[PDB]
Amino acid sequence: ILQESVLNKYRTAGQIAQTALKYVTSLINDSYHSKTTQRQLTVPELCLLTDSFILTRLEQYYKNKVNERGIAIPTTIDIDQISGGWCPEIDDTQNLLNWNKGKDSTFASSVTGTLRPGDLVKITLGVHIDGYTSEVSHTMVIYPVDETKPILQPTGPLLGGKADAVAAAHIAMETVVALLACALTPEKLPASLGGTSSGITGQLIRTIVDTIARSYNCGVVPGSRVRRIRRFLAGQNEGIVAEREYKGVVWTESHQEADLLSAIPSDDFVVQSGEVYLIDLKMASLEHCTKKGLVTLETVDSYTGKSHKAGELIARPGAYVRDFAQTHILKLKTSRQLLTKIDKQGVYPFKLSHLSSNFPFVHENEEELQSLKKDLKSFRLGMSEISNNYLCVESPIQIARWVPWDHILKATNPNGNLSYDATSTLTLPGHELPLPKLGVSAIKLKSLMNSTKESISLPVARECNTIVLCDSSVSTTDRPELLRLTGGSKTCQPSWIHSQHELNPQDSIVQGIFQLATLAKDKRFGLLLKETQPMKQK
Amino acid sequence: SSLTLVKEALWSVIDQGTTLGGPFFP
């Protein structure tokens, strides 16, 4: 239930998230675009600096007034085919180099930590105060800097499928934000889009997002969601921890199958006032796919000895999730002390470096970094026994993959629905049906993906914001309005792209999208969006 | 067979522009 104090806690979390996103954007621009910095920063350094900045900023807010506050989502930097879960520690850089020596260079940016021109860099971070969570995620583009222009600018706009994915994600984000804002004043919903006297539904959300994705020739990655957020329940680990109640719309391989054939989440709800909504949309480009196929996810392991595929990425996930329902008294004193530190963090995913007493840095020092690494060695020693007794689990690294439909149809599964992954460590992904109508299990689909020679990895663009549907008493302006805690025109400004694809205006859904854009621009009689501003540091 | 009918239907169903941003680094 929205209140002045609850809204203020959400607002402060959103402000800290916006400031952190501006910080990472400035760091990346200085390292790769401005080039004032002598040595370019790497991805683990950027993640660590972002986390330290967030902790330093959050130290001053709600101190000695709130039991639990901290980082909700660790800083994740995903490049191209990687659709989530990439937050490596600083002590795994040489590990990554040694594990990926002799592989292809398709994941060279992730392996070396150094960004390259043409990269789609997706930055995700979240902040919670008293369990009230605000999460932001922005795709940006890395460009070569033109040496001839007096001012710094890209030589040319980004072109191709990555540009299509960025455009689709940005336009879907804006349209969904406007559509969810329309729930407060339902009469302003366009007639071509849906019923004037009726509200916003998950069916309308899904058909709008699918229409935008199909227009821009992109698929929706099966991790996308437009869901409701409560205290401590923000989907911070959605594929790992089951939830009692779910109110939102999700996209899966089952939904892709149903669209082709045209506590379980269902799109049979009505958006209500006084609610907080997370919108996380991942769009994968389908430019290189000459036929109709299915978009799925591939989990990255750290074992180089499982295959001979030179186009494989070998890495260890850096974010862990504590399972508070599991208890086991450990044998190592280091492991027991680490578990005591872990239980202080709460119910959000955490990095091993977040548990260091040296972290966050008061002054950025080489000695501070070295003491952090010295802590991290014993932290890994304790984490080995913690993970062995199922007290904590890894947050997976996932690569988007494309599997054609003809290979799936020609394949034979002798088990049907009965097959499942017995070696899987987590319950929720281990027993899953990605293709319920075809009777294909997750293990069977992974086997098909590995068996096909024409299964490729699709570039992904991501946009994720948090919004509040503020009622008239809740809002300052005496009218219902949408408060965007994260994202907007100041932090998530789109990069220079040029996409040949476009929305086709001769469709009712596209006309409703254009009218939603018009009514969002209309600041007099239309809808009211209040963006949350990043704060100044000096 | 319902599975066979589903597979047959699947086989049947499978058988300017836009510009964002500008010449600047946000």
Binding site: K410, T412, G416 | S1, L3, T4
Partner: protein
């Protein structure tokens, strides 16, 4: 009637040789006749079956069904075609084990060694 003293008409020996033949011998044992079109085109009658050639079923309940060879399961003296399956309600598909003597090749997978084999059997390709 046999005339060579090096060949045996013993049923026990023949059956043991068949059921203990190694993989390379089973390749020859698993031969399929060509279609009439391919027989006229290439000038040969039968060839050992391999993975990527298209076949027509001419015997059994699956007679008339066409498809591409999916596997040559030499361990069970059978071939598997992609389109010929047994389906269940739960979504399970079990390949039908077909014998190449009951199949007809309608399109050969042609490589260098396949062309050499056809020519040394007496082919007239192109």
């Amino acid at each position: 009637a046999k005339q060579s003293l090096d060949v045996s008409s013993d049923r026990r020996k023949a059956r043991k040789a068949y059921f203990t033949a190694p993989s390379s011998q089973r390749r020859v044992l698993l031969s399929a006749p060509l279609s009439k079109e391919l027989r006229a085109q290439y000038g040969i009658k039968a060839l050992p079956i391999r993975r990527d050639d298209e076949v027509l079923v001419v015997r059994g309940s699956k007679k008339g069904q066409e498809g591409k060879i999916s596997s040559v399961y030499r361990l069970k003296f059978a071939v598997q075609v992609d389109k010929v399956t047994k389906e269940k309600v739960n979504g399970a598909s079990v390949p039908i084990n077909l014998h190449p003597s009951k199949l007809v090749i309608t399109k050969l997978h042609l490589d260098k060694d396949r062309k050499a084999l056809i020519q040394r059997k007496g082919g007239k390709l192109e």
